[PDB]
Copies of this chain bind each other. A is one copy, B any other.
């Protein structure tokens, strides 16, 4: 039975780790041969979930073509967010909830994207479609992904489907979603103890917006000022990445997850397009974005329109 690898994006988050584990479980329970893997270090929010539910971290890989011919992507599609040698393997399936870009196949495939708040909400439907029981620990990881992506049901990407899926999965997992979820989210927002290099990379994604090359990184914090007081250090590492990767823009979004507001720090030739996108004035490279917490819903679309 031909082996496949399943993985999410570079700089993995809880949905990218847990949705890879869950979809590999659904495949293997149906008699196939899948291994969930990861493309970077597990963050502290995800580690809390894996520890709580007694599950192992997926194996770390740098490339896939040395191992397999076919892969499945979860929680992303764009080539520059994926594994370094993505061109060298066949993408058999994608299960995702993002915009589509920089993604091509030579052959027909199973591509399933729904504009819901979490990839795991889609995988929940797929377990039921295939008459596979969800084990307690698997449901716990799927719940963890929904809580992470929805910021405990506060994010504007959260839908009635995500809420319903979380209710089902919390019951299967044997946990109170609010109590568990608060503890998990707090494990991820712990950060006056992280390097600025980690801050700008632990939830960074690259994009192309028209002709322009862009990186958008986000930090969950419970306090904007204990990030903002490090602006000189943040500018030094961000400017280095801008030069090395030839970026037109690096946008750091520092989100207060308990107030649902964000501070932007924008560096690069196209920093003024942030002003157009959010109707905002950059002063000393920053601006407050009130209400903005979602990169896929509230940052990527307007930044595209402003840049074009």
Contacts and interface: CB of A to CB of B under 8 A. Distances in A.
Contact of A99 (B102, B108, B112): B108
B100 A103 contact: yes
Interface in A60-116: 97-115
Given A100-B105, A106-B305, 7 more contacts: A99-B104, A100-B111, A106-B300, A107-B115, A109-B115, A111-B111, A112-B112
A112 B115 contact: no
A107 B297 contact: yes
Interface residues of A, number: 26
Interface of A: 97-115, 157, 296-297, 300-301, 304-305
Contacts of A114: 110
A108 B296 contact: yes
A106 B301 CA distance: 5
A51 to B, nearest CB: 31
Nearest to A113: B111
Nearest to A305: B106
A113 B106 contact: no
Contact of A112 (B105, B106, B111, B157): B111
Contacts of A113: 108-112
A107 B113 CA distance: 12
